[PDB]
């Protein structure tokens, strides 16, 4: 999934003009509703899915980088272990989540030659990054204190 400007967009799902809603399960916490969750059985499948996702990502050029990113990106892998000793053990014992996050780089505006739509994208990116910095500092202070 990608976060472009406070909207979640799916990448493996083909061209879909609509956005995806964010809802909080009372027990499992935040999540995104109707994310195209795809299974895999061969390395070729995940490789092709990764290629398609990188292709469909929104990317624009600027003075700092010919191919910069205009959106935060999140890659998630859900992995299940099934122990099937029929005499003793049970299946679906362990479920694990692996998350890999690529964040957009802070924009300095005047140094990047941003203008028009690029400037608004930079502003939204900076707002998100500042919020991230505030939580990080707060959470660090909180765990350090207690």
């Amino acid at each position: 999934m990608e976060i472009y400007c406070e909207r979640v967009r799916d990448l493996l799902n083909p061209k879909n003009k609509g956005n995806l809603r964010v809802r909080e399960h009372p027990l499992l916490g935040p999540y995104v509703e109707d994310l195209s969750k795809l299974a895999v059985t061969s390395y070729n499948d995940i490789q092709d899915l990764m290629d398609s996702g990188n292709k469909a990502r929104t990317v624009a050029a600027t003075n700092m980088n010919e191919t910069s990113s205009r959106s935060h990106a999140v890659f998630n892998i859900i992995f299940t272990q099934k122990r099937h000793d029929a005499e003793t053990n049970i299946t679906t014992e362990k479920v694990s989540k692996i998350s890999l996050v690529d964040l957009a780089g802070s924009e300095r505006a005047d140094s990047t030659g941003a203008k028009g739509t690029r400037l608004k994208e930079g502003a939204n990116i900076n707002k998100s990054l500042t919020t991230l910095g505030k939580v990080i500092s707060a959470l660090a202070e909180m765990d350090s204190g207690p």
């Binding site: 809802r23 909080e24 009372p26």
Partner: protein, 432 residues
């Protein structure tokens, strides 16, 4: 130029808007037919903020009326100012919401929202440089909450840059008129906290208290409450329309008021108030207005500001007055009640002054306060919400219209998080 678009939804919003239009028109001098009959030349200088031209030297307000019951539309048309509005802007349906948030938000409102949005696009396209929107509605009701929230969401989606305001009447603590107020109020606040840019919290109990204690009326009706609210609404946006020594756009108020994005709930106030037959005793001046303005009895939010701290505050004066007196009075108020002001904002009073006072008021002042004590209001609703959600008192009416318990749970959690944020600053100490 700064054009505002005005929307009204539900019985409460429509009646408030009718009274408000009957006021602004006098301030600018417009006859009920539409023609202009005034005396000063400043009245037409900025009339385009609210009104559009029409060929016969006529003025039509830039308003939109919304409901799902023809009764309120009929009442508004069959009235003193019914002929001032454009007929095409009367959008309505039949088989109203019936005090059900689900019917307003999902089932019935979803049909009429497209027509309402078409009218809104047509009205906004003609504006030269649109400033923002404003919408009047009641949270405890049906039609108002659902359709207002849906329209706010859609308009924010389409016009992300402009300002959105709201003058919402919240459920009162004790004077109640609907049995399922908490569900609608919670579900509405869950979206208001996210989408809009400012919100002014009105409560009927506070208005009745002002009417009976200050104005000394004997049989207040909803007309007087609409009067007070209209006075405040007109006073907030004066600096767009008349010249002054210190202007204050809506965006400037937004920047100076809210310190963080989620804390955009305000308590409004207006001064003076002599109750008549006692105007000859009170000497009207700047310190008298400041004394009446910061008093607790005057507040319209039905919440005591002494139980928290003022995150910040803004005062808009209208009259011909000296700047030193204003600055000295605001400094004195800040220094005297030093406990009730947050300590990590060195100066937390925004000031504006305009030269043209109301028709017959040598002076006037409007007050917009942002204080932690507002959390009390939300807590009340939350408590009542739990008392009816633990046993699912009236839930099936909502679930029959396409909802689920998860929606209620996330709304309750979001409002509780709001209460926790406001409570984070309320206590003293904190400091550096």
């Amino acid at each position: 130029m700064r054009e505002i678009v005005h929307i009204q939804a539900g019985q409460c919003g429509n009646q408030i808007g009718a009274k408000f239009w009957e006021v602004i028109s006098d301030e600018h001098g417009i006859d009920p037919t539409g023609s202009y009959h005034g005396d000063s030349d400043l009245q037409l200088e900025r009339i385009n903020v609210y009104y559009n031209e029409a060929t016969g030297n006529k003025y039509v307000p830039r308003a939109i009326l919304v409901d799902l019951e023809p009764g309120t539309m009929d009442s508004v048309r069959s009235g003193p100012f019914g002929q001032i509005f454009r007929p095409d802007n009367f959008v309505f349906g039949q088989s109203g919401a019936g005090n059900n948030w689900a019917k307003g938000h999902y089932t019935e409102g979803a049909e009429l929202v497209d027509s309402v949005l078409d009218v809104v696009r047509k009205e906004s396209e003609s504006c030269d440089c649109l400033q923002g929107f404003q919408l009047t509605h009641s949270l405890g009701g049906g039609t108002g909450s659902g359709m207002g929230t849906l329209l706010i969401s859609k308009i924010r989606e389409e016009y992300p840059d402009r300002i959105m305001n709201t003058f919402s009447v919240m459920p009162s603590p004790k004077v109640s008129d609907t049995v399922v107020e908490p569900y609608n109020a919670t579900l509405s606040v869950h979206q208001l906290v996210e989408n809009t840019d400012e919100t002014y919290c009105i409560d009927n109990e506070a208005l009745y208290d002002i009417c009976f204690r200050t104005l000394k009326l004997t049989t207040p009706t909803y007309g007087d409450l609409n009067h007070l609210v209209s006075a405040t609404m007109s006073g907030v946006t004066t600096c767009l329309r008349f010249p002054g020594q210190l202007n204050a756009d809506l965006r400037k108020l937004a920047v100076n008021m809210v310190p963080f994005p989620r804390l955009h709930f305000f308590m409004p106030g207006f001064a003076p108030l002599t109750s008549r037959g006692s105007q000859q005793y009170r000497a009207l001046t700047v310190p008298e207005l400041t004394q009446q303005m910061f008093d607790s009895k005057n507040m319209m939010a039905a919440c005591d500001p002494r139980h928290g701290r003022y995150l910040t505050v803004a005062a808009i004066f209208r009259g011909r007055m000296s700047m030193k007196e204003v600055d000295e009075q605001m400094l004195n108020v800040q220094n005297k009640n030093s406990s009730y002001f947050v300590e990590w904002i060195p100066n937390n009073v925004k000031t504006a002054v305009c030269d043209i006072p109301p028709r017959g008021l040598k002076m006037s002042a409007t007050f917009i306060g942002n204080s932690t004590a507002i959390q009390e209001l939300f807590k009340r609703i939350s408590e009542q919400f739990t008392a009816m959600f633990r046993r699912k008192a009236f839930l099936h009416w909502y679930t029959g219209e396409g909802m689920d318990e998860m929606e209620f749970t996330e709304a309750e959690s979001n409002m509780n998080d709001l209460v926790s944020e406001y409570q984070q600053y309320q206590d003293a100490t904190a400091d550096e």
